[PDB]
Design a protein around this ligand. Structure first.
Ligand SMILES: NC(=O)C[C@H]([NH3+])C(=O)NS(=O)(=O)OC[C@H]1O[C@@H](n2cnc3c(N)ncnc32)[C@H](O)[C@@H]1O
Ligand SMILES: NC(=O)C[C@H]([NH3+])C(=O)NS(=O)(=O)OC[C@H]1O[C@@H](n2cnc3c(N)ncnc32)[C@H](O)[C@@H]1O
Ligand SMILES: [Mg+2]
Ligand SMILES: [Mg+2]
Lengths: 438, 438
């Protein structure tokens, strides 16, 4: 029967068929050494002369990289093998030979070349591990919220309303000269969903007109955006903590093989899986940065009332063994929808969660304004056209309740967990400022 | 403790708190009749004088529609109640009153008005049932493929490559005058994924520049697009059947309450849940249409070699108690990527699956060309720029294998299962030709 390498362990001492590709080959003496990939793993295959037809054995000398194979043999247990098993080959059929030289040969390549050949690179072990961890998180997100009786609620991609500032917005031409924007966040719609279904979350693509090539920016990425009716600022942070803890615990438990392949230390992720996340006010945070900055001139200082930069977040996150919250920022550097702190009219009830080891923001959230008139002032204070947000105001006119929510950047979470050098490695086909292909 | 109506059954004869909204109210005699919504269901609440403060009882006279409430009471079993239970009210707190009249009052409204107020309409029972069935399918898709060891693989949204014809493509302006297209299908990338991970599927938004307002067209919708290495035309149809069967079985088993609310007969969906889907060649299909057309002048005839229309599909699907396959269409009315039938050079190895009761196409799929030179001819035969598809050609140069896949339109599947009159009712915030708001 045809099996998958993923489950070769439960086919020990049995006749099996594999369908896959030739990853590597060495031919010396009276034995061929093969590594086969099938898409679910990598397995050692040995072709010994006598045990195979001479028509086969001569063919196994002229097999280039990424040759398509069908392979028949018996599975044997062996400690000195990638996985602890091997295939003793008995017969072999070639489905196709490479039409040219395989571009990603046994040489070191620069990231630029690798990303130019991303459609081929995805075959290799490191992307293999990443994509499987991405899959694990995507499944695990659905289970988490399903068990909590949350409803998935797909926010529209085409939108008239801006969410996070007029500065960076893509435009789409429609019919008869009409235009619309590409969603930067589906939050506004998630709120409507919240007042309708109590517990909702979006899980769709989002688009920012970013103009940098930093290790944490893409033009296209995926955002998970929960929203809950009646939920406070405090409850929001607790939920975020519950989520991140579960995700990391799930990766540690089920994807330990993949972590190994990425050379990531599990002991550096266990703390994040166990909750008890530290917590700072913005003020305490700015003060801790200014301490670090005075001891290290590479870390820049931060004047109070100014917005955090990546090095600020980076330095701050290295002080903790797990993600740290930063809360109660000044209203003037935040968003129009954010609820004022009842104690201090300068602050809003928001939070960002920073990933450890220098990674920075993985989540941004807040409590929302529920008072109609307060919202109206905020709109035009931010200089936003009131007309466009009239459906958003309806949510305050009818059935208005306190409510909170956040948005988790999936790529950034993937980069952190896998320990990658850039978010572009965390998605199949990245879209950056200067990278629109393939 | 605060509970949800969704699970009121396991709180019988207990003190509970509800947080929700007033759906309907009638006040006569010495008793108030309430229906409360909380987002997870609808429950009957009774406020009897004496059992409540007089400050509360007088207030329960001036409670408009969609008032925000907190409510304390004991749960009592009662056969004559929506769900089989009620809340005996003891105390009540109002969180907010409507700022104006609630637009969707106890009158009949046209669909145009309802869709203009979609952000409010989502609160009502029929959308409630739809969105919960949509949620059920979205979770169930992930379980199906996860258990089969398939990998979720997110295809890019921004793309240079067209998939289903140059005719209908949106354009996005980027940086420095550059432009890209909105994905109409992520298939091309799913193929790269297939050669890398063997068993993959996308589950993202897709965009067609459709210019009609028919009951099955949107500009924005969600497509599930599996792709498998080594899989034939025959195996493809079997997999599609396996998928649709599971989805419908899952809805029938877990969402029977929601079906009731939509007035959908379960007996009309059971057949689709049990496999054994009928099958036609294109030729046999055209011939059966021409029979129907000759008996009914409302059903139009179909000349052989011409592409099916919605009435053709509609009439055809009514002849079966479950979804029917139509396979082996003429190459000239199909796509560039489709593999030629080895027996007949006029035909390609494709299939469409039609949903019963007049619904029509829910799936479109095929086997793919794996021969490099054959693909090159097809490209420029269709008049497509070879340069743009050079990464697609690489998949034929290196590790090229036979492979097949399909794409399932989620909205159309939702419309069918729920028995809706239009696909716009099957997504939270639809985007049609003349409907871009809210
Ligand atoms: N529903 C909500 O409350 C979300 C909220 N409206 C919002 O969009 N805030 S956020 O932009 O800071 O958060 C977006 C998150 O998404 C990530 N993000 C934000 N921008 C990017 C870019 N350019 N590339 C990759 N990832 C990005 C980052 O992890 C952020 O935490
Ligand atoms: N990966 C693949 O093999 C998919 C393939 N490249 C494809 O796009 N073919 S399809 O357009 O016929 O199928 C798209 C499906 O998606 C649905 N569809 C297709 N177009 C629409 C519109 N405009 N609105 C709503 N739904 C639509 C319909 O159910 C189709 O079966
Ligand atoms: Mg932010
Ligand atoms: Mg089609």
């Amino acid at each position: 029967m045809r099996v998958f390498i993923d489950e070769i362990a439960r086919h020990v001492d049995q006749e099996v068929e594999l369908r896959g590709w030739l990853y590597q080959r060495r031919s010396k003496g009276k034995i061929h050494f093969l590594i086969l990939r099938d898409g679910t793993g990598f397995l050692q295959a040995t072709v010994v002369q006598g045990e195979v037809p001479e028509a086969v054995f001569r063919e196994a000398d002229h097999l280039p990289q990424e040759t398509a194979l069908r392979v028949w043999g018996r599975v044997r247990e062996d400690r000195r093998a990638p996985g602890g098993f091997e295939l003793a080959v008995r017969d072999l059929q070639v489905v196709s030979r490479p039409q040219g030289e395989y571009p990603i040969g046994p040489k070191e390549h620069g990231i630029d070349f690798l990303m130019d050949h991303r459609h081929l690179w995805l075959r290799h072990r490191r992307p293999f591990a990443v994509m499987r961890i991405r899959d694990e998180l995507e499944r695990a997100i659905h289970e988490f919220f399903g068990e909590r009786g949350f409803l998935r609620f797909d926010a529209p991609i085409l939108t008239p309303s801006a969410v996070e500032g007029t500065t960076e917005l893509f435009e789409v031409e429609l019919f008869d000269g009409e235009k619309a924007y590409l969603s930067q966040s589906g939050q506004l719609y998630a709120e409507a969903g919240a007042l309708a279904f109590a517990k909702v979350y979006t899980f769709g693509p989002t688009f920012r007109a970013e103009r940098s090539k930093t290790r944490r920016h893409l033009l296209e990425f995926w955002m998970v955006e929960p929203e809950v009716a009646f939920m406070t600022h405090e409850e929001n942070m607790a939920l975020q903590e519950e989520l991140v803890s579960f995700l990391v615990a799930r990766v540690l438990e089920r994807r330990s093989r993949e972590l190994e392949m990425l050379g990531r230390d599990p002991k550096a992720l266990e703390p994040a899986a166990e909750g008890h996340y530290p917590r700072l006010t913005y003020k305490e945070a700015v003060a801790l940065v200014n301490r670090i900055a005075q001891e290290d001139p590479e870390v820049p200082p931060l004047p109070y009332g100014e917005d955090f930069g990546a090095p600020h977040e980076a330095a701050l996150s290295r002080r903790f063994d797990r993600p740290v919250f930063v809360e109660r920022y000044p209203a003037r550097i935040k968003a129009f929808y954010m609820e004022p702190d009842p104690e201090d009219p300068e602050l809003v009830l928001n939070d960002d969660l920073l990933a450890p080891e220098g990674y920075g923001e993985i989540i941004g959230g807040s409590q929302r304004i529920h008072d109609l008139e307060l919202l109206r002032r905020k709109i035009q204070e931010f200089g936003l056209p009131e007309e466009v947000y009239d459906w958003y105001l309806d949510l305050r006119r009818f059935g208005s309740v306190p409510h909170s929510g956040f948005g988790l950047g999936l790529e950034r979470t993937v980069a952190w967990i896998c320990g990658l050098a850039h978010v572009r490695e965390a998605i199949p086909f990245p879209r950056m400022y200067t990278r629109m292909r393939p």
